[PDB]
Amino acid sequence: MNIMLTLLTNVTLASLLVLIAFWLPQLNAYSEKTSPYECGFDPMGSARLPFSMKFFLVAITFLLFDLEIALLLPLPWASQTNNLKTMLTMALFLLILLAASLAYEWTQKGLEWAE
Amino acid sequence: MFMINILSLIIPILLAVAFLTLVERKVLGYMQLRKGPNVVGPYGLLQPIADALKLVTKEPLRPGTSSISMFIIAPILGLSLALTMWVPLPMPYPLINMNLGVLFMLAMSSLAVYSILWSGWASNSKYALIGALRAVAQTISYEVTLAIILLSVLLMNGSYTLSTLITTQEHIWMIFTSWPLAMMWFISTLAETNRAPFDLTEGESELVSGFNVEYAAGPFAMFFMAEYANIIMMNAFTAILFLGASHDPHTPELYTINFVLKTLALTITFLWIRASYPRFRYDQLMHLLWKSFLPLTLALCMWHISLPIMTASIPPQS
Amino acid sequence: MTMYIAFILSTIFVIGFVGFSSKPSPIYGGLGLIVSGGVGCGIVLNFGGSFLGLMVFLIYLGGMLVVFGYTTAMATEMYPEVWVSNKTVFGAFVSGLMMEFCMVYYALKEEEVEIIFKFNGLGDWVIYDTGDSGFFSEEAMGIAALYSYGTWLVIVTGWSLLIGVVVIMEITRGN
Amino acid sequence: TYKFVNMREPSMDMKSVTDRAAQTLLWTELVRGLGMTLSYLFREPATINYPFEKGPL
Amino acid sequence: RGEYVVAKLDDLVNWARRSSLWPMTFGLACCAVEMMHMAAPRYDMDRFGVVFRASPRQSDVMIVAGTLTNKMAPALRKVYDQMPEPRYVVSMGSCANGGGYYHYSYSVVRGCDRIVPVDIYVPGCPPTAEALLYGILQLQRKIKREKRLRIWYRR
Amino acid sequence: MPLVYMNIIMAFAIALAGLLMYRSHLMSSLLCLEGMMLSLFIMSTLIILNTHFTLANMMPIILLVFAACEAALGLSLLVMVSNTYGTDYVQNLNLLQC
Amino acid sequence: AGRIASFLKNAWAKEPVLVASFAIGGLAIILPSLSPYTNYAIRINRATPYNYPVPLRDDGNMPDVPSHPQDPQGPSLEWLKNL
Amino acid sequence: MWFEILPGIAVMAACLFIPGMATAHIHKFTNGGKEKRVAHFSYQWNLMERDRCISGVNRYHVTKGLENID
């Protein structure tokens, strides 16, 4: 009831503002006006050719790191159990393994960007 | 009148975002011995309206190499999510009393990067693609610590519902319990909002305008809407989390005033740091976190995991 | 109407699946999976589960962001394709969309389709159970028992993640 | 006559290293940077009211 | 009456345009230094509504400050093309106005007007930051005197 | 045997068909694989939430856990095919045929 | 001391963030076993009633089970009230 | 000389004030003065539904105490 009514309100307000922005100002367009901006002079020509990203290792291990937080997040409800010893051991196990993963990456170049 | 509440959570927020530009150009200018906007009416109280009028009547050119569809869907995505993430905030009584408000806001904050992503890629520019990739790296790095710090801080809350934070900080601000994490958290709020000294996605000095470089008139004003609404919402979330305030159940206006004042102070500190630092260099803001923020926040996560157990202070979930 | 809700969200789920299963440019496929994951989180939310849907949301947005970051870096072309640019991707999109159209057509009138499994499609509200969760959400206590009951799952998942980082290191070493 | 602008080796006494670590963890020179700009905001602006006020010639 | 309504709309739109003139960071030579000094605290462009902004897509007025040479003129013309309309060109300094000191050189455009339509000619070598502020205010009054919707009503 | 299950199963079927058919790229097939994973998660979550199998709600979380790991390994494989090949297309990956 | 103290001091000099993180982690690992309140925490989690204490059939013998909530025999949590 | 800055926050404060009060007042207006009852768990929702049933007029906020029973 409430949440999608909200979401709809935001999206229609945004689409409207786009509509007034794009139909009212009486644009006058020509080819050189929409030409790509390359600090003045005409671009060499690319903007879709492969763009090397040297943190590719870092970028991908972000996926595993952010994945572990899925295991981590049930903790506020996990603390309220009758087996606090096992819960504490397992939570520290997750955190220690993440520390070990980060340390292994740090020592074996890893987080350092490629050149 | 639920529609009334929804409109009352949008128009005032947009007006506050508009006046955020004026207070920024005044506070910053007074840092730099200038005076800031002063001509339009009294004390520049009409500048937000003036440039609002300009940006929606100036010609919104579409580049010949653009991808029309995503070039248009990105501003809508940005503004819609920036406005939506205001609904679960426990301003006296939250509009949408969700049981998982923190997780919801994390999800929408992670989604907000996709506006930058699609706007940068669809614009077909070297600078825009560069800025999009810098945004990729920045938001992933800082999102990891965002999630971990949120878990660590909320371990004392007992759940993820935003309203109970008010109950949690009934007698003491949470910052007195987790001041280290708070520092890191503040820095993360600086970076996820893509502000200084981590505003490398725009990089006015080195990337001209970053991912807004081919965005003109209305869509540009709209991306600015998203950015400033995110600034204010992040400062509001930080105020809700750490700097709690007294809440009389009979007069919620007192909590409204206190919360608004705390958000204003946090935003003013945002503009303060924006005008007092050089700018980070890409990898540094990554090497800052993956090598200094991440280990410290992991250690603090273990500490706050153990802390309720060692002191028999596990907060209730209900 | 609000009677079904889950039905319509499932159709958007399938449409998003068709979008990225048609082999478009990987950015467009990522967008299609994004909408599919969002509406799937909506379905899980509407089916009495809150944590699971938001977890899908967060995790899949992280994964798809990294997929984008790699796509414009490694798996790009001088001429990125659209769902209407090439005739092959257009054919795949057409096949998927008309297919699911006729599946839901055969579904929501007869409501007794046999396809693979017997599908009596009266309404998803029907299968819901009249129960009482008291003062604890069942899903919260369910995924909160991982640290108390599923210790073996904890061990195997942590070991798998650590060795996954190790292999992500070794594969990408490049001599 | 010449001076070495950057030829200062930091002391390695336990107090010195504790202070350096405190400055690193508890950002100290960063707080000084904040304080300088706070001090100048509270200062008087230098802008003149053109065209009602004209710069000296 | 319709004339009054379009008049008021003209005043509103012209006021917005003149009160939020966003210039471009296109300093070329010594005329840029004064272009900075009026951005300096003493004169402070910011109080007049004018804030510097690169990326021509989001700028209105171009202050051509400095000598415009042959090697740069194509870049200036192209960059002027990127500006979405309405656009204004303010010419700072004698060099950008008509040639200045190097008017008889081999690689200097004898006036920025030969490449873009210059809207305000600010004289000086270099013009005093007060003089450039005066030129900007003159451009502001120019925008104030626009009659777009009036002409549309009398199409 | 209820209705929503039909839609999720059908979505998984199209994702299985999409994975088993390549056109040009390697990223698209990986995306189709993670779509298969998404359909699996939604299906299993529906099943266990419906049956009130409270102890089994961790199962979709472990599903996603290994999901991300496989996606990561596959895209590292794509990194290497790009490093030794410049691009990621599969039809030019033929050096092992003989 | 000697090598160990010099290494600790050099680590404090060079990388204080790592030193702080390792110290906090070790503390958070080894203190909880030593602290006596841990058991208390468990008892608190056992004290909080989520499900109804379903009554059992009184076929006589059992003395400990109360016949009324106000009756003295049975488990009590005055310790939690005091603590 | 920063008091000229102060109006910018002032009106903005009013802006940030407007939702926080309005929602609260709305929650009081649409629920008969009292705070909006929040159902974070199924028990609270069951209580709200039984309130809606007992009220007879199909609004949960309308409460009946001793006068309703004999």
Ligand SMILES: COC1=C(OC)C(=O)C(C/C=C(\C)CC/C=C(\C)CC/C=C(\C)CC/C=C(\C)CC/C=C(/C)CC/C=C(/C)CC/C=C(\C)CC/C=C(\C)CC/C=C(\C)CCC=C(C)C)=C(C)C1=O
């Ligand atoms: C060594 O030699 C060198 C040269 O040698 C020749 C050179 O030449 C050069 C080059 C020369 C230069 C670079 C020139 C010098 C430049 C400078 C010194 C720079 C100076 C800059 C400044 C003074 C300004 C700095 C800016 C600051 C401090 C702040 C800027 C911030 C802002 C926010 C600006 C405002 C912008 C925007 C977009 C905000 C406005 C928008 C809004 C308010 C929108 C509001 C909208 C609404 C309210 C909508 C409301 C809607 C509602 C309610 C409903 C809607 C719904 C509907 C349905 C309709 C250099 C560098 C050089 O080194």
Ligand code: SF4
């Ligand atoms: S007009 Fe004078 S000050 Fe300006 S660029 Fe030419 S020589 Fe330099």
